[PDB]
């Protein structure tokens, strides 16, 4: 199932065996709550005043390679719907369709078909029972309105993750079933609703004509079940005796990779992706589209089809990288890097250089004064032995500070340092 | 109103037409809640014990160019007030002035005039009605105390945004009216209270002599209605056939710019600023003070009055930048960059290079495997055609990795690469 | 007590006098809540249905030198315990020991001794009193279950800081006393429980056999009361008349330093550390282990025992750094940098260069259009006058863009710029 390979030659590891679940687009839906414009006998007297204060508040409300990523507007789609609800009659168009039912699709003015929902009916409640047991239904239906108000006030009207007050599980699962997507998307979203909530936006919209409206921006997973893999990289330095004469090298192309429509979506920020079992939930807005030949950098970093990105330095500090099925340890200098078991203690001492250890039998990794716990996910690891490529470079002609560089950029910068020695032969 | 210009020569865009609302200073106010030191008939028995537990908890509580920004202490002003409240008698000085009223100004010991507030009076409530209808007022007045306690415990005593429990809308708006500032500030803060909350701090202070105190740090908007504009920049690379031989260039001076007292405040992190309609709420602590000649970089990047900051690389990856009134697309390589309408599909395919499209008629922008929604704010855009300045450079003498550089730094580094060729003429 | 020294020669300051409280390891504990599998008289009718909905939800739930830091898995230890609770019989092993008591240690299958806790007993409550005063105990015991559910749903099952619903103060303090650590750790954690909460994780685990379980990951403070100090650095540029001909220099080794087992733990991100009085709560996962000779860079930056890290540029923009006992001001160009008192106004105007001022007598620092408040902590400051080291460099042979560099890297790069002039003598 989940496997992992470590490349001693490049001091990197690839955790493959995952499945994709990428957000490609958005789905907007207008959630409405009908309100009553109002102006045992004493319990409602103080609970109805919370209603007058929530409406009072809501009216005051409306009235390494990460630097290469694009800069988009996340809620640009949802706000594009709220500018339509501000139009005259566009509110009554929704209030008319949501008359005899709570779920109805309303074709808006600008050719936008939105799935509207009437999740709460306070107008039909305050005007039917609160005109001079039922205090329970009021104190509970009003409590949800207060909670929607609290989230929209301490967030300037944009909520994420979408809480159960903006959309209950019964409303959300019913909204997932009714929205028109494939059967694979419907069950993927239904089995991981808390992930859909974290990738969803609740946008305060308008209060007009006894109605509170707010758009719930939901993710569309156009890419499902395609192979994904996470690349872990660590510095690869030399281990010479005299400190300072050491040169380093680090693959900067680390992050989440997923096959996507002939190309490969690369997420340089592994926190934009979320792993549930072997499923990887990412957001394409934080991605880069790369040719599928980018995977060649793991096996052969010197391949001619893709220029693998690296960074160079002389800072040979020790660091560890907890991988999906093990840990990469870059031990340099006088650092004490060990790998220990829970009930037995230290089982391996890392020699100077970049080494690797699997989580099978290892519980913690110690580098210096820091203790790192390894992930105990079951999986098979593989150690691909090889000569560290940092030994292939001459330290005297090695560029000591390149960050947005690659294998070829370093090689093409070394060769014209060897043009200066064509004058040295005088 | 809101306009935008795109510069093809520099692959950048300027969204002008905004108004300023910058936080220049702070305003401290001590919010107090009087407590009763205590030690239908059974409802209060379990509600009064929440009071004993909240007080028990609170006693345990107290007892690109972003790297150029300054490093300040945000709550340095508010904490400077809490060290004054710990002084002996300084608590009783407040408890004495807040005797017959809830709002009173207390001149503190170190020459600090603070606007004190008694938002809740539990001592006057527990000692007047809870000694052996009113269970409502207790269960609601005590519920606010519990909520103030919950926020101060899960935040180590510092709360932002200031919730309605720390300061209700009635208390906040009354605190805004009573604080001594100009009439323009009072209405700006009163119409955007949820923005003031997000720029405010609630700092737990002290519990001494039956009183709970906490300072609410409020923003002062010394700069209002001055012109602001947001600069969007994208990489500008060459489109040669052989990949790798391409050189790139990107204006690093992007962010929010606002005219401010002869100079211009520059916010390199556009997330420190918040846009409501055409108003821009920024925080000067995340700003840089630049000469007003910085705006010359948009029209002429080679102007002699200001050295426009750029960064160079050979990484010609495709990226898009969703602007205020459109989108900038930097399409390089085999990437499929398109701009589509909602109900009609693709309307433009971007050729290789840096192009631009306005939101009038365009709903989405596709670059690679990513879909970006454009902001649908109404405004007039302008395409300033011009020769891309990256064509003016020779790739063989082009510095391939400069980040904290400028136009002159590149030109002064190219010329001494042309001193090496004065030896080449042998 | 708390002191501070400013180094004019290197434009840096060291705030010493602190004590350490570093998280070295974790402590896992399984928190359990027994549930009843169910399927004045009408109050429970709607409160018991919240119980059926919380269980319904939870079942859907489960079923500068910062780039040198390591990459670990924070909850790798806690999740390693939840994979053990999913084993058959491992749930009943816990449900058996927590029979006659609420606190009991359960030795798990994989040789893991965990301190289990039964914080809530709803099975013993619903099955003892809710089969056809007590509505109070139900509406309050059920309200905690709802709050644990709300946090676990809007956070995908991982909560931090651990709220009082996951673990009350009575349960937490009792869990701190019963866990086996030294007496110094027990009182350190008991006096700063809100800090322990912010460094703790609440991980949703399993619902099986009428039991809800979730692991609370607690910090272990293996390093206590060792000396700590925070290094503040600011750019140090030249003040030549013609702008652009100026060279800059900045010590990149800023952050929190703490003596730790012969070495020194360095935290380049000062936000990973938390200061309470003179105690510094850090997390070693965001640390680097450096030789104790790193402190030599403050007194003599040119010392031969450690290569002090610096960065160079030509960007002479003005910036300020609010220190622990004062403020560092780097005033360059036409910027107006002042230091003012509260009741008297400007008391010092900063000349061009890097200067410093103590908080004794100063309340604010103004640099450009920004107002910075100084921290008013009582302490003695010291101004170590010295020649700024930037004057020791020739601007014509000064590397204008080095970030991951040091004193020796610059000196070894200057000398081979002086090899090019051995050809200039022709
Ligand atoms: C080694 C390293 C590690 C992490 C880090 O954030 C940086 C900072 N940094 C540099 N490096 C500068 C400039 C280029 N080089 C200049 C050689 N003449 C080296 C010093 N280029 C950057 C780019 C392009 C984007 C974002 C950050 C960049 N460098």
């Amino acid at each position: 199932n989940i496997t992992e390979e470590f490349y001693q030659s490049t001091c990197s590891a690839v955790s493959k065996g995952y499945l994709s679940a990428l957000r490609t687009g958005w789905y907007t839906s207008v959630i409405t709550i009908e309100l009553s414009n109002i102006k045992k006998v004493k319990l409602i007297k103080q609970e109805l005043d919370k209603y007058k204060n929530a409406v009072t508040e809501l009216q005051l409300l409306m009235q390494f390679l990460g630097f290469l990523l694009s800069v988009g507007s996340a809620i640009a789609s949802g706000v594009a719907v709220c500018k339509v609800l501000h139009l005259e009659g566009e509110v009554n168009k929704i209030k008319s369709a949501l008359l005899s039912t709570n779920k109805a699709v309303v074709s808006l003015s600008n050719g936008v078909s939105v799935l509207t929902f009437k999740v709460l009916d306070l107008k039909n409640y305050i005007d039917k029972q609160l005109l001079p047991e039922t205090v329970i239904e009021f104190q509970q239906k009003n409590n949800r309105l207060l909670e929607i108000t609290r989230e929209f006030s301490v967030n300037a009207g944009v909520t994420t993750p979408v809480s159960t007050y903006m959309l209950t599980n019964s409303e959300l699962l019913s909204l997932i079933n009714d929205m028109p997507i494939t059967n694979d998307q419907k069950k993927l979203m239904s089995n991981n609703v808390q992930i859909v909530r974290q990738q969803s936006y609740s946008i305060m919209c308008i209060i007009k004509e006894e109605v509170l409206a707010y758009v719930v921006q939901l993710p569309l997973y156009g890419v499902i079940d395609t192979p994904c893999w996470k690349l872990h990289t660590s510095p690869l330095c030399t281990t010479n005796t005299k400190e300072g004469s050491n040169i380093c090298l680090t693959r900067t192309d680390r992050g989440w990779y997923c096959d996507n429509a002939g190309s490969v979506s690369f997420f340089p920020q592994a926190e934009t992706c979320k792993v549930q079992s072997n499923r990887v939930f990412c957001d394409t807005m934080n991605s880069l589209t790369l040719p599928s030949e980018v995977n060649l950098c793991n096996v052969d970093i010197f391949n001619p089809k893709y220029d693998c990105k690296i960074m160079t330095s002389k800072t040979d500090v020790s660091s560890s990288v907890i991988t999906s099925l093990g840990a990469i340890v870059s031990c340099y200098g006088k650092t004490k890097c060990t790998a220990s078991n829970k009930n037995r203690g230290i089982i391996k001492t890392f020699s100077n250089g970049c080494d690797y250890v699997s989580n099978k039998g290892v519980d913690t990794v110690s580098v210096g004064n820091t203790l790192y716990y390894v992930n105990k996910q079951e999986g098979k690891s593989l150690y691909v032995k090889g000569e560290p490529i940092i030994n292939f470079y001459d330290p005297l002609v090695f560029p000591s500070d390149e960050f947005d560089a690659s294998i070829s950029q370093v090689n093409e910068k070394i060769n014209q340092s060897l043009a200066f020695i064509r004058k040295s032969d005088e």
Side-chain angles (χ1 to χ4, degrees), chain A:
Chain A
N1 197 26
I2 291 290
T3 69
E4 191 180 71
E5 300 166 329
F6 169 77
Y7 305 102
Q8 181 187 11
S9 56
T10 58
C11 187
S12 56
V14 177
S15 303
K16 50 187 60 178
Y18 297 85
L19 294 182
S20 59
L22 320 177
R23 183 207 69 81
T24 65
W26 295 105
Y27 182 64
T28 54
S29 61
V30 178
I31 307 302
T32 67
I33 291 182
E34 291 188 354
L35 306 176
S36 187
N37 186 255
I38 59 109
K39 292 145 187 171
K40 306 177 183 179
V41 195
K42 302 155 190 175
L43 255 178
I44 308 282
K45 289 186 176 181
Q46 290 79 60
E47 185 73 15
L48 184 75
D49 295 1
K50 302 170 179 290
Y51 173 89
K52 267 179 167 173
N53 265 8
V55 181
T56 304
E57 164 86 31
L58 294 175
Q59 289 176 340
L60 299 174
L61 177 60
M62 52 165 296
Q63 301 170 336
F64 281 114
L65 308 178
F67 61 96
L68 302 173
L69 289 176
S70 318
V71 182
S73 181
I75 62 176
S77 55
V79 179
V81 183
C82 280
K83 264 185 283 294
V84 182
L85 299 193
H86 284 50
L87 306 180
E88 297 300 324
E90 215 66 25
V91 172
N92 281 323
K93 284 181 55 183
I94 289 179
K95 200 176 186 296
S96 305
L98 293 186
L99 198 61
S100 300
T101 182
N102 304 328
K103 173 139 50 187
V105 174
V106 177
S107 56
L108 292 186
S109 57
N110 55 331
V112 186
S113 179
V114 291
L115 176 45
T116 324
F117 218 115
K118 185 169 62 179
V119 298
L120 198 62
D121 208 343
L122 287 186
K123 160 184 163 55
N124 187 265
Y125 185 88
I126 301 182
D127 294 333
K128 194 191 296 181
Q129 292 94 354
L130 294 182
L131 272 64
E133 290 179 345
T134 55
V135 58
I136 314 300
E137 293 182 351
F138 183 67
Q139 289 176 343
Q140 303 299 337
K141 278 193 171 184
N142 181 82
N143 196 92
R144 180 188 176 185
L145 170 62
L146 302 174
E147 288 299 324
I148 297 179
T149 299
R150 295 169 189 176
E151 303 183 18
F152 276 161
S153 72
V154 305
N155 283 85
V158 187
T159 296
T160 176
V162 172
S163 63
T164 62
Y165 298 104
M166 309 289 178
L167 212 62
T168 76
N169 287 5
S170 55
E171 298 156 356
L172 172 60
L173 291 166
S174 303
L175 192 59
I176 295 177
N177 176 35
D178 207 297
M179 69 175 60
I181 46 186
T182 180
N183 295 277
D184 294 9
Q185 280 193 77
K186 294 186 178 183
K187 192 150 189 174
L188 174 78
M189 299 174 61
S190 300
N191 297 340
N192 306 268
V193 301
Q194 68 286 344
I195 304 294
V196 178
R197 293 181 179 276
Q198 292 186 337
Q199 304 194 259
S200 301
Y201 282 93
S202 180
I203 305 174
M204 169 61 178
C205 215
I206 191 183
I207 290 193
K208 190 163 69 70
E209 313 188 61
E210 291 177 66
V211 176
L212 162 64
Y214 60 95
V215 177
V216 168
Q217 198 173 286
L218 295 170
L220 290 182
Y221 296 86
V223 178
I224 298 181
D225 294 333
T226 59
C228 291
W229 61 96
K230 182 183 177 186
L231 176 57
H232 316 257
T233 78
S234 192
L236 176 59
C237 310
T238 66
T239 63
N240 282 329
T241 50
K242 46 174 182 179
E243 51 196 351
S245 70
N246 287 320
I247 59 179
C248 295
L249 184 147
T250 309
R251 295 182 57 187
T252 45
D253 57 355
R254 67 201 202 180
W256 271 104
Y257 293 82
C258 295
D259 277 309
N260 191 339
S263 302
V264 166
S265 295
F266 167 57
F267 311 88
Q269 301 165 329
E271 66 278 16
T272 72
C273 294
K274 320 162 203 306
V275 172
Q276 298 292 336
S277 69
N278 56 5
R279 185 82 58 171
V280 189
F281 290 91
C282 300
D283 197 311
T284 50
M285 188 168 300
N286 306 128
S287 73
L288 294 180
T289 309
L290 307 183
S292 62
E293 286 79 2
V294 65
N295 188 85
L296 308 181
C297 288
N298 306 318
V299 279
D300 184 12
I301 196 178
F302 300 105
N303 69 90
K305 287 199 173 187
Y306 194 89
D307 200 12
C308 311
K309 304 202 59 57
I310 60 172
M311 63 155 288
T312 68
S313 64
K314 306 257 287 180
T315 309
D316 53 333
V317 295
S318 296
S319 65
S320 182
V321 179
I322 298 302
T323 70
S324 304
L325 298 179
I328 302 173
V329 182
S330 299
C331 208
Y332 307 105
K334 297 171 172 295
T335 316
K336 179 182 182 66
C337 316
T338 63
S340 307
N341 188 264
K342 184 189 183 67
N343 309 125
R344 302 185 302 270
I346 296 182
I347 73 175
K348 175 183 179 59
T349 302
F350 294 100
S351 299
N352 285 335
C354 170
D355 217 338
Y356 171 86
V357 66
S358 59
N359 60 342
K360 293 182 294 299
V362 180
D363 282 301
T364 57
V365 166
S366 305
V367 175
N369 297 329
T370 315
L371 182 67
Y372 298 102
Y373 279 85
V374 301
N375 291 117
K376 303 258 74 175
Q377 181 69 36
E378 171 56 39
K380 296 184 176 61
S381 304
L382 185 57
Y383 198 110
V384 185
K385 297 167 293 182
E387 174 83 351
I389 67 174
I390 191 56
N391 301 330
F392 297 148
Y393 291 88
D394 186 18
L396 295 179
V397 296
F398 191 78
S400 61
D401 192 6
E402 298 290 316
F403 177 71
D404 193 0
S406 62
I407 299 288
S408 296
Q409 288 196 34
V410 171
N411 291 330
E412 79 177 10
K413 193 170 174 59
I414 288 175
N415 289 337
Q416 64 181 17
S417 297
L418 274 57
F420 296 161
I421 66 180
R422 277 193 64 93
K423 183 191 63 64
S424 179
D425 63 356
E426 299 306 321

